[PDB]
Design a protein around this ligand. Sequence first.
Ligand SMILES: O=C(NO)C(F)(F)C(F)(F)C(F)(F)C(F)(F)C(F)(F)C(F)(F)C(=O)Nc1ccccc1
Ligand SMILES: O=C(NO)C(F)(F)C(F)(F)C(F)(F)C(F)(F)C(F)(F)C(F)(F)C(=O)Nc1ccccc1
Ligand SMILES: O=C(NO)C(F)(F)C(F)(F)C(F)(F)C(F)(F)C(F)(F)C(F)(F)C(=O)Nc1ccccc1
Ligand SMILES: O=C(NO)C(F)(F)C(F)(F)C(F)(F)C(F)(F)C(F)(F)C(F)(F)C(=O)Nc1ccccc1
Ligand SMILES: [K+]
Ligand SMILES: [K+]
Ligand SMILES: [K+]
Ligand SMILES: [K+]
Ligand SMILES: [K+]
Ligand SMILES: [K+]
Ligand SMILES: [K+]
Ligand SMILES: [K+]
Ligand SMILES: [Zn+2]
Ligand SMILES: [Zn+2]
Ligand SMILES: [Zn+2]
Ligand SMILES: [Zn+2]
Lengths: 375, 369, 375, 369
Amino acid sequence: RRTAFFFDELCLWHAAGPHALTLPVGGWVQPPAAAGHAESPETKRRLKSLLDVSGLTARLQLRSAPPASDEDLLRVHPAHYLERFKALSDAGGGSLGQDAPIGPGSYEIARLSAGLAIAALDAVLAGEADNAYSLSRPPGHHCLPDQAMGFCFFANIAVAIEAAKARHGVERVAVLDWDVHHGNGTQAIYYRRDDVLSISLHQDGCFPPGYSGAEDIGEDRGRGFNLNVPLLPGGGHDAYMQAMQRIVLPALERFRPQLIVVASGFDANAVDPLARMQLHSDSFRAMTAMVRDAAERHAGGRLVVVHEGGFSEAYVPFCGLAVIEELSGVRSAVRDPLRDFIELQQPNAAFRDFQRQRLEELAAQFGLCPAQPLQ
Amino acid sequence: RRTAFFFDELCLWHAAGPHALTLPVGGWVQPPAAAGHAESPETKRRLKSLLDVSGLTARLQLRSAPPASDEDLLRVHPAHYLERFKALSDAGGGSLGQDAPIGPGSYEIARLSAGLAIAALDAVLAGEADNAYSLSRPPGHHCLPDQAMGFCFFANIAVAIEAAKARHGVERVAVLDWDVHHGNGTQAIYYRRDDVLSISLHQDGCFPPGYSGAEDIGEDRGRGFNLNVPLLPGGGHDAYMQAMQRIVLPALERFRPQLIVVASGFDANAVDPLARMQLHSDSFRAMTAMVRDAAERHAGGRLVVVHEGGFSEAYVPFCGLAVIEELSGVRSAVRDPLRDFIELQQPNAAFRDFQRQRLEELAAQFGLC
Amino acid sequence: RRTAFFFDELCLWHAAGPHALTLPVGGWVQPPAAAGHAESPETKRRLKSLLDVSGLTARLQLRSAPPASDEDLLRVHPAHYLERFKALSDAGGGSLGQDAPIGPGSYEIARLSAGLAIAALDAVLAGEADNAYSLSRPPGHHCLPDQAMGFCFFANIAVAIEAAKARHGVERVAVLDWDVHHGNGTQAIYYRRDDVLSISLHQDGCFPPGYSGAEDIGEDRGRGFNLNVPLLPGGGHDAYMQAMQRIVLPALERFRPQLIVVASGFDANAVDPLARMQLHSDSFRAMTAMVRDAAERHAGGRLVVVHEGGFSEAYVPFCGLAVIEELSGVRSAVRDPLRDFIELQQPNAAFRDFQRQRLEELAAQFGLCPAQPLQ
Amino acid sequence: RRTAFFFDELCLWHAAGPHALTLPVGGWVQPPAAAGHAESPETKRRLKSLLDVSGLTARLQLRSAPPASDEDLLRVHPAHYLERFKALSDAGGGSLGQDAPIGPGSYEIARLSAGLAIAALDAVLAGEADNAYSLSRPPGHHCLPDQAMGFCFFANIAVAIEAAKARHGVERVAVLDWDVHHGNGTQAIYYRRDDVLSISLHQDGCFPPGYSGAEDIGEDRGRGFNLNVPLLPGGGHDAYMQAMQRIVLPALERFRPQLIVVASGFDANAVDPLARMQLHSDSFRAMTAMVRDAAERHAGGRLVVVHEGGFSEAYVPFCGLAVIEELSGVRSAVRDPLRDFIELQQPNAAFRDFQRQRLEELAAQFGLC
Ligand SMILES: O=C(NO)C(F)(F)C(F)(F)C(F)(F)C(F)(F)C(F)(F)C(F)(F)C(=O)Nc1ccccc1
Ligand SMILES: O=C(NO)C(F)(F)C(F)(F)C(F)(F)C(F)(F)C(F)(F)C(F)(F)C(=O)Nc1ccccc1
Ligand SMILES: O=C(NO)C(F)(F)C(F)(F)C(F)(F)C(F)(F)C(F)(F)C(F)(F)C(=O)Nc1ccccc1
Ligand SMILES: O=C(NO)C(F)(F)C(F)(F)C(F)(F)C(F)(F)C(F)(F)C(F)(F)C(=O)Nc1ccccc1
Ligand SMILES: [K+]
Ligand SMILES: [K+]
Ligand SMILES: [K+]
Ligand SMILES: [K+]
Ligand SMILES: [K+]
Ligand SMILES: [K+]
Ligand SMILES: [K+]
Ligand SMILES: [K+]
Ligand SMILES: [Zn+2]
Ligand SMILES: [Zn+2]
Ligand SMILES: [Zn+2]
Ligand SMILES: [Zn+2]
């Protein structure tokens, strides 16, 4: 298998003002002596470093891309938003919204991030690669057309899809969003559309705070083409496996995607500060295997994974490595040193059963028939 | 209310070798560009900085203490353990056990940490203060007599209790351990004893990994005098409130403690990387209120809170501040900026009810209903 | 001796946007993975930590102070400057000038820094202490009345002096500025005044860049009441000792100060990135001893040392500790672990002689008679 | 021009125990909240990042290399030194000498660093590239055969030269060492040899502390084939240009090198904490131009630049970029933002003249005038 790795060093140079985790410094929040922000470069940089020393980068098709044009961005965002973003970026940065801080030059770098997503879809649709991974920083899946949120400043995946439709005329794209937070940007943009199936697995009520969203299934033309799976906080491997088998795979089976895009955050990992789920690297490996399989049966193998969240410096690299091994069909010598340990922390039988029953009920609410994958 | 704050700057100078969170650097674990260890000074330093900026330090009785003597340490740990610890500390540090890395001078600093715990109990028992908070770094509650674990190198609380019994002859001490991990050190040391009631609230299976422990209630003379409450991962405020009201307060009521010691980690907070629970600063405020109340009723107000775990730099200070406000009866101008946000993320009604039913069953199992 | 240590934890919470040393992040300057700015809290925080663990803090008279009022600040700065500073500070920070970046809440913290300086002079003038040290962050000595420069946002020492004149009517204050950079703020404010003798020891041409200033001795009423000693880059202990003995002590002798204020940066230390001089902790000890002596003979012992620059995290604490030992008359158990090493790196005889001859010529240019200290 | 860039990500994973700048943490030296060591990865990583963002990496011949074999290392270092290094590396690290701390796995990574130097000489001697740059971390130029010093654990350049002589039979190599500290490792190894001309430009008395060395010109067969230029602290661009024109270029002219190797530290830069000199990125550009020119005239263009010291995170990348632009003949869009500022800080005319006169005298002493 030929996997394109879309990466640019410059995406790692985007940096907001001082923050303690996600809290803007000021008031009662003391400046951290080192850290600086949640959406730091280090988590993505360490993924890249581990890919290099493992020998995996040598086996991928390593690509960059031009930054997203105004044409591409305007399919989603209004000019006055671009202008506001740019002016704030040229004046040294600041706050572009609620939980949306930017640094100097962040406009240009956000454009580059969006271009990588655009290019990754283009490459896979054009037959240049079987699948692709885009290390797109800053992330995209919370961003609304006219409102930056959740450290996202462009709707990377939505911009990529709209560009893909204009260049290739793809008619059915599925977006599976396994970032631990709710993919509200993708949901809102495609909410009344049936050419895009948007599925979000997320921790119930995490971000946006208090939002579950199971009853939000899309409207009119898009009714049934948006699906939220609000998993109970504390869940791990089995919760995600059950969600995949009872909701995701049956939904993709019904939708028959010609392209699958994954909004892949790794903030469901067991040591992430920004959520409470218990995934290990093999959990992300298994989800990728399931989604790759779905792509091989419906979409001619056309799968793109776009990097979204994931805050843990120590553990994100191992989770992201697992995904890329699974996309490329290449297994490195890397051994996840937290794997066995995270196994022992998983929910007990009673808790697993309780989450399983809720997923069964949810699959029934959605009108998903428990069929088996086929071609 | 007169609250003693036991603190020494030197406790913040203990530092292990390079780690990525809890993973020792080496093999596939790249050295972090900044961070360093999990048990870093910063989390405790930022608690101290927020206490100072809030003006609350000015209302406490600020104290240090001599480091723990060999006499005190030897009540719990063997001489060969002290020697082994010391030699490794003199030779620049390294690994004293599984998840127990030390740096140069860490022996001396561990002794100082233990002395603060000793002195805090002493002060409260002697009537020098109504209650006390000991910012004891490195922490203590995982450490066995001859085995360092979980970044603990001396059993600070056990060492403090044994010293208290020798100096004051206190007969009944309750140790409430609300660090999110299991207080296995305190459990093992006091396991066959009824002069010490050890209670651990912890995330089911977190650390030690795979351990719940509800059935482990003590043995022979200590049967019934150890209680584990393994809360489901993902739980937050209500889970802890229910645990306090159905298990902890009834257990303390039955035991009639003459002194309450709290092993207070803040790693149950909603943004901690080292567990999966959802507590906010008012959760720790409420638990402290409930334990203070229990102390006022049985123990002449004698309450000591010893700092244990808590990894989140950003949020531990607010949780620790809340505790100390509650101990002192002084409310500062500090407003927790995550509070409203963490409310919205709490378990839904169905999950709350599920955890509540388990706690009811557990309280029945323990004969506390 | 009774030494007041004016300190507030909140001064350590002032933090600018991301910088690589002194370079604002953006363009070709990548965000640092840890550091964040030159004027970081850590250098001052580590001074405070070393003072604590040494037992010295227990022997000082530890004080805070109210922040500087508008009244006090307006003696130097215009209202529109205060308003501009404040607005930028309330909007999350940014760039208040050339090399003058601020963070959110920096206005309030700058006011606190200035209040510590005001209070330190007040305490010493009121007989509450023999001398004082003010750990005033952010620093002051580059700041002009209507222009922030060199990470200084208020003219701390000038604000303190003008307040001291209003409360106590002190008639002759000497400001000795041994920060390695030129004290241009103090120079410009007091330039035509003879009630304030301003003396700057600095590295020739360091900051402001290209400025030496030996011929800038004040004008009209202030002619002869400003003195610049531009020391050659590379100089260390002997260069500073010779400057003190041939220029500073004779100048103070002529001026008969009723109060001595020291603008004490430690960026002349041998490992500072922001200059090229070779001082060790005993060099700062000796300069403090000389200045304390001058204060005991003219000023009733009235000496205030205000912390200015110093970037080295490792070595500033030892230099600042040395000063405070010398102010308090208390020698701790701390042993400077770079001392012997820095001794061996000092300029050779030929270089020492070359710098000595220039200082002799300069003392003659200034019309300083080589008299001996007396009372 | 075809420039090989020898680089391996794994060299950036070497990391010693906690230090404050160069001071080992312990005693009165508090652990830094962020930093860690002087010889940190960041300075070299940021050079690599700027090369990538500039598009210059795309114009180089990017290479890695096998780590140095025992055969190669043993030409310089004894087996017992390898064993001692390795054992300390397997046991988590510690102190291999005075200013020579290592971390876990540092033995393997030091071997990799040395292999890059070996491979860079090999490539240039074999005609695979016109010149080369080796980003060899950890550095090499202070390391003696049986004594680690100055954060160097193998004598990278010496090991590379000895390997080059065995494989290619090159007879005359010049080593120009413009790291701001004295290249004592290269000086001592080649001290009685005339097949290697070792030249060190360094700050008078910086490191090793108190050493100038102008009188140390080699002995017996090597007499005249070692040259030290101890520049006065505080010197910058002109001092270095004068040293190059009056000492270095005439010496190379007399020696007729078949290969030039540069020990290129950037710690002479104007903002380095580890010395007191005032170089900007164009200074390193000019020195590289002058040495490339010398290589074109005697050595068929054969020039290798091996990365040594340089501590400034902010400014080393710009200085290293300048060198590589000059090697490759490719000028990127990068503009050095400190350049104009460092011009204004240069020594005045009187100081320049004073240093110039000393260099004239020194060139006369050496018989090069
Ligand atoms: O993973 C992310 N996106 O998928 C994320 F953006 F990083 C986030 F969503 F996790 C968040 F955006 F980081 C966050 F967690 F949602 C958040 F926005 F950072 C926050 F935690 F919700 C947050 O910012 N909380 C705050 C609460 C009060 C005041 C300021 C911030
Ligand atoms: O909070 C603590 N004490 O109250 C704690 F000991 F720090 C801990 F329990 F959080 C812990 F030590 F951090 C830990 F969780 F036990 C642990 F040690 F960090 C760990 F998570 F167990 C851990 O470090 N696990 C590892 C597993 C494999 C390899 C390295 C580390
Ligand atoms: O020590 C200081 N004051 O006494 C100092 F402010 F930190 C400084 F003066 F050293 C400085 F201000 F730090 C500085 F060194 F002068 C400086 F301003 F930071 C700088 F080094 F001069 C500087 O900022 N240089 C720059 C050059 C080009 C572009 C931006 C900044
Ligand atoms: O640049 C270097 N090599 O080219 C260097 F070796 F790193 C150094 F020379 F800069 C050095 F090693 F940093 C150093 F300068 F030699 C040194 F080791 F850092 C030091 F400055 F010598 C030093 O560390 N001195 C100490 C003195 C006393 C106690 C601890 C350290
Ligand atoms: K999601
Ligand atoms: K849809
Ligand atoms: K517990
Ligand atoms: K018990
Ligand atoms: K000065
Ligand atoms: K004047
Ligand atoms: K040299
Ligand atoms: K030689
Ligand atoms: Zn997320
Ligand atoms: Zn814990
Ligand atoms: Zn300065
Ligand atoms: Zn060097």
